[PDB]
Structure formats: structure tokens, C-alpha cells
Structure 1
Amino acid sequence: ATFEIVNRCSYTVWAAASKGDAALDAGGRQLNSGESWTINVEPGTNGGKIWARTDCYFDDSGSGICKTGDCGGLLRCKRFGRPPTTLAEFSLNQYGKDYIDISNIKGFNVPMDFSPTTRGCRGVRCAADIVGQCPAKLKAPGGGCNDACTVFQTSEYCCTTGKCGPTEYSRFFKRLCPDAFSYVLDKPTTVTCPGSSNYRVTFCPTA
């Protein structure tokens, strides 16, 4: 599938794309306000994610640090990023279908729309002002809203026993973005799309 990644924020984002053990396409790219990056993701890819990184500082070698979503200090990500990160998640061509979602399980940093380019399925969006409303204990330094698992590292929030339920903190995200995962065992908000589908991920969507 083709993904057009578009930054409509007033600020630069450093887009990232990975399946956890490898880059997708070039893995990362600086997108100043108004810029776009079109990537190819191999058909059949499972566990792919796209996210924004904010306030990055890179040297000539593409090494440095980002305030949110840092992936081992690299411009071109090969691994997933440090929370808080709003996540566009996808597995492609699993038995003839694509499966997409947005997740707040690793927190929220940038508002996001994740939409198919086809009429065959719907998009999802999480663009509420989660950072401005973020409870003090979840606030990430300088920007973003951490998930409770990141902050507290207990089974209640991280769902490590394999059994967990909603919490005051998951509900915070869920009420602001009902169509995004708010904890690991949230009722799925995954959208099923045709296998031929391409996508657009928009940071700071408007219309």
C-alpha cells in the first residue's frame, strides 16, 4: 500500500514509519508545515506504525534526539518511538483485507487523521486537544500526554497479566477520542479495508 503522510500542523514534525524490527520505506523524514511524504509499505506487512515526532534536533549524520517519539536517536527510524506518540497502526493484506486503527495506548503527541483513499471503508481520527487537557500526572515534559502504563508501570495500566479493564486514565483518552484504542484490551476500533487500499495520514487535520 501507498501512504501519503501530510503535515498540516503549524510546526515541523519528523514523520516515522516502522514495523518494530525494521524501517518502513526510508523510516523517517522531516516534514515542515505543509510538506508531505509518500511511502510504500510492502503488501502483507503486519504490525506497521506511523507516527509524528516533535521537537527533534539532528546533526549532519541524522543522529540526535526528539522531544516525543524518539526512535533510538535516529532521523530514519528502524524501531518504534518513545511515548508519547499518537499511533497510526496497520496490518495489510491479512487474508484479503487491511486492518487500520489509531491508538493512544502509548500516549498522544500530535492530532491525527488516518483515512483510506478508497470509498470501501471509513477513516479514523483523534484530533481532540488531549495535550491541553492532559492530567498533570500524565503530562510529558515539554509536550505530549503519556499513557498511564508508561508513567506508572503497573499491571492495572500495562495489562501484563493479560487481564485488565478501563481506568481513570484510559477513560481520559477514550472520552476525547472514542475511535482510538485507550488501553491494550479496549473494545477494538479497528477498521477493515479492501486489500487494494492506499492511505493518507494527516497531522493536525482540519476538514
Structure 2
Amino acid sequence: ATFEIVNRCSYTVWAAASKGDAALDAGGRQLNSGESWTINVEPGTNGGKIWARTDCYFDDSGSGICKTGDCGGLLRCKRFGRPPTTLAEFSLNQYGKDYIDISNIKGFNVPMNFSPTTRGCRGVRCAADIVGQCPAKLKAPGGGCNDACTVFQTSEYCCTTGKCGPTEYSRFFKRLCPDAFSYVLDKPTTVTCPGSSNYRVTFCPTA
């Protein structure tokens, strides 16, 4: 499958792509404002994610650090990144269909559109100014807007079974981005696409 990753933001981002135990394609790359990076994601990739990282620096070998979304200090990510990270999540060729979503469950850093470039399904977007509106307690010192479970580490915010529901801090994200997950038990906002679709992830998509 082809994934085009396009940075429309005014700032540089360091894109990342991983399935948790390995890189997808090169795993990560600097994207200047306006730059695009096209990757190949193997058919049958389950549990893949793409995200942006902000305020990074790397040496010539690809070792360094990012303020949001750092993946073990690497440019070429092999594992998932440190919150807060807006997440494009996908599982491909799963019993004939692909499944895509955007999630704020691990916070928000950069606005994103995640859309098919082939026929037969909708895209999703979370492009509100979540960082500017971030509630004071959720502001991340290094930039971005943390999810409540990361900040508070209580069952109310982190529960995955219960006795578990939305809160004002999960609703903060859901109100601004209805089409992205805000907590683990949200009514799903996953899109089912034809198997073997192609996609574009756009950072700071055009309104």
C-alpha cells in the first residue's frame, strides 16, 4: 500500500511510521514545510501508526531527541513515540478490509487529515487548535496537549474496563475533534475501507 505523508505545517515536523515492533519503511524522516514523503506499507500490516514529532534535533547518524513523539531517540523510528501524539492508526488487509482512525487517546500535537487516495470510503480529520485550547492541566511542558490518563494516572481517566466513561478532559478532545477517539471506550470512529487502499496523511491539512 502506498502512504503519502505530507507536511503542510509552517514548522518542520519529523514524521514517523511504525507497527510497534519495527519501522514501516524508513521509520521516520524530517519533513520541511511543504514536503512530502511517500512510503510503502506492506499488505497485512496490523496495528500500524503514523505520527508527527515536533522540535527535534538529530545528528548525522540519526540519533537525537524530539519534544513530542520521541521514539527511543531515533530519527528512523522502530517503536511508538512518547505522548502527546496525534495518531493515524491503520490495520490493512484484515479479512478483506482496511481499518483506519485518528486517535487523541495519547494526546494531540499536530493537526492531521488521514484520507484514502483510492475509492470507497471517507477520510477523517482532527484539525482544530487543540494545542491553543488545551486545558491548563493537560498542557505538555515540551509542547502539545496531553491526554488525561497520561497526566493524572487514575482509573477514572485510564480505565479500560468499568465503571468507565467520558470525562470533561476526554470531552475536551472529542468536542473539538468528533471524528477522533478521545478515550478507549468512545463509540468507534474507525472507517472501514476496501482492502489494499492507498492513503495520505496530511499534517496541518488545508481547511
- TM-score when scaled to structure 1? 0.98
Whether contact under 8 Å (2:160, 2:184) holds in the other structure is: no
**Structure 2 CA distance for aligned equivalents of residues 192 and 171 of structure 1:** 24
Give the drift of 1:160: 4.2
Which residue does the alignment assign to 2:55? 55
Give the drift of 1:163: 5.0
Which residue does the alignment assign to 1:118? 118
**Structure 2 CA distance for aligned equivalents of residues 110 and 191 of structure 1:** 21
Whether contact under 8 Å (1:54, 1:66) holds in the other structure is: yes
Whether contact under 8 Å (1:5, 1:202) holds in the other structure is: yes
**Structure 2 CA distance for aligned equivalents of residues 163 and 25 of structure 1:** 40
**Structure 2 CA distance for aligned equivalents of residues 173 and 161 of structure 1:** 20
SS in 2 for 1:3: strand
**Structure 2 CA distance for aligned equivalents of residues 28 and 18 of structure 1:** 9
Q: How many matched pairs?
A: 207
Give the drift of 1:156: 1.4
CA displacement, residues 77-101 of structure 1 (integer Å, 9 cap, x when unaligned): 0000000000000000001100000
CA displacement, residues 64-87 of structure 1 (integer Å, 9 cap, x when unaligned): 110000001000000000000000
**Structure 1 CA distance for aligned equivalents of residues 93 and 155 of structure 2:** 33
Q: What CA RMSD, in Å, does the superposition of the two structures yield over aligned residues? A: 1.0
Which residue does the alignment assign to 2:199? 199
Sequence identity, in percent? 100
Whether contact under 8 Å (1:155, 1:161) holds in the other structure is: no
CA displacement, residues 28-84 of structure 1 (integer Å, 9 cap, x when unaligned): 000000111111111111100000000001112211110000001000000000000
Whether contact under 8 Å (1:16, 1:77) holds in the other structure is: yes
**Structure 2 CA distance for aligned equivalents of residues 205 and 161 of structure 1:** 35
CA displacement, residues 135-169 of structure 1 (integer Å, 9 cap, x when unaligned): 01000014100001111111211124465210111
CA displacement, residues 88-126 of structure 1 (integer Å, 9 cap, x when unaligned): 000000011000000000000000000001230000000
Unmatched segments (≥5 aa) in structure 1: none
- Which range moved further: 152-161 or 12-21? 152-161
- TM-score when scaled to structure 2? 0.98
Whether contact under 8 Å (1:2, 1:39) holds in the other structure is: yes
Unmatched segments (≥5 aa) in structure 2: none
